[PDB]
Every structure is written in structure tokens, then in C-alpha cells.
């Protein structure tokens, strides 16, 4: 859980939205993205492997 | 919506989980994080500004 | 069923593979897999 | 100058790569690099499948 730097790419519109959400809570970009992963984690892990027959 | 590169920081455990989710769908890291934002966007935007009296 | 293999690439080629992966919102492994499928026959043909 | 990268392969495809490497007294990395050189142009020419402008 020690921090690791990772470069990602975003559509400008999505990045802008993430930036405004960070600013609104006096928070870092990475923080808002981390909270989004905590909210989404379970839907994303539960979805089957789309290209694997067994999934 | 043209792509923009942004460096973020993650706890190693969360990054590892994002990486395994990307791999499982033969997908990029940025893609899995984008799908998480689409899922979380609405909870995060709806939450009041925690430090602003009016929020 | 998937198996992990470490390979070596010249930095320029790796960068090119990465930009192709990014352009299709795809993983590195995916781009390389599609390249094998495309090249398989030229590779099998060229001499021993 | 070279970089090590971990990749994932279906066992059948990896096995095929391995047999091709052996047949030419070549490394795995070499055969995969030659496959990129051959495929590069088809792959770059194919449009961005998710982008309207492509």
C-alpha cells in the first residue's frame, strides 16, 4: 500500500471531470481516482472474462 | 475526448488489482480505470463539498 | 489458457508496441498476440 | 537498447513461438520481434476501433 506512480491516459472531458471533483473536495487527482476504484472494484471483478469461453 | 496522459499514484495492492483486471479482459490499465470512473462518477459528483458550509 | 513470458525489446520497438496498444485501448500482450497471428506464415516459411 | 517486458500468451501460441525459435536456433524474443516487424504496418493502418475519427 506504499504509493506507486503510474501514467494513465484519459479523454480530455473525463480528465477535466476528475480534476473538478478533486478541486471540489480540496483533494489530489489520485485520491478521486482511488475512491472511484473502491466504488467500481466489485462490478468490474464480477464481470466475466469477455474473451475466455469459461470467463 | 482526444487522449491525455496523466501520472497518478496508487497503493501497490490497488495498482496490482487494476493490472490483474486489465489483463483478465486483454485490456489497457487506462481502460479499466476509465470504466471505474463511469461506474463511480455519479456517487462522487453527488457527494457534497466536505469542507464548504453550503457543499 | 494464458501463460506469462518475459521477452526483450529495443526501447524504440517497445514504445511502438505500447502506442499501438494505447490506440486500441488494449494490453501489450494483445497487440503482440495479433502480430503473431499476422506474421505466423512468413516466420514458419523463412529458412532453418 | 533492449528492455525486458512480461507478456501473456495462450499456451498453444507460446508453444508455437517456442518451436519456431528452436527451428531457427533463435531466441523467443527474436521471433516475436520479427513478427512485430512483419505485422507493424497492418496493425498501424487498421483504424482506432473505438474512436469515431479512427
Numbering used by the authors:
A (entry chain C), B (entry chain C): 4 to 58
C (entry chain B): 5 to 52
D (entry chain A): 5 to 58
Question: What is the paper's account of this structure, in its own sentences?
Answer:
We show that CdbA is a tetrameric ribbon-helix-helix DNA binding protein and changes conformation upon c-di-GMP binding. Consistently, c-di-GMP and DNA binding are mutually exclusive. In vivo CdbA is essential, while CdbB is not, and depletion of CdbA causes defects in chromosome organization and segregation resulting in defects in cell division. CdbA is abundant and binds globally to the M. xanthus chromosome. These observations are in agreement with a model whereby CdbA is a ligand-regulated nucleoid-associated protein (NAP) important for chromosome organization and segregation and in which CdbA activity is modulated by c-di-GMP.
We obtained two crystal forms of full-length CdbA-His6. Successful model building of the first form allowed us to solve the second form via molecular replacement. This form has three copies of the protein in the asymmetric unit, one of which forms a tetramer via crystallographic symmetry (four copies of same chain) and two of which form a dimer within the asymmetric unit, which then tetramerizes over the final crystallographic axis. The tetramer centers on residue F50 of the two innermost chains, and the C-terminal tails can be traced five residues further than in form one, and with the C-terminal tail of the innermost chains in a dimer contacting an opposing dimer. Protein–protein contacts mediated by the tail region include a hydrophobic component from F50 and V53 in one chain projecting towards a pocket in the opposing dimer formed by W34/I42/I47, a second hydrophobic interaction between V56 and P14/M17, and a more polar interface between the free carbonyl groups of A52/V53/D55 and the side chains of Q38 and K41. The arrangement of the two dimers in the tetramer places their β-sheets ~35 Å apart (measured between Cα atoms of equivalent Y12 residues). Using the RHH protein Arc, which binds DNA as a tetramer and with the two β-sheets separated by 26Å40,41, as a template, we created a model of how CdbA could bind DNA. Because the β-sheets are ~35 Å apart in CdbA, this model suggests that CdbA bends DNA upon binding. The tetramer interface displays different hydrophobic packing between the two crystal forms we observed here, suggesting that it may have inherent plasticity that allows it to undergo this change.
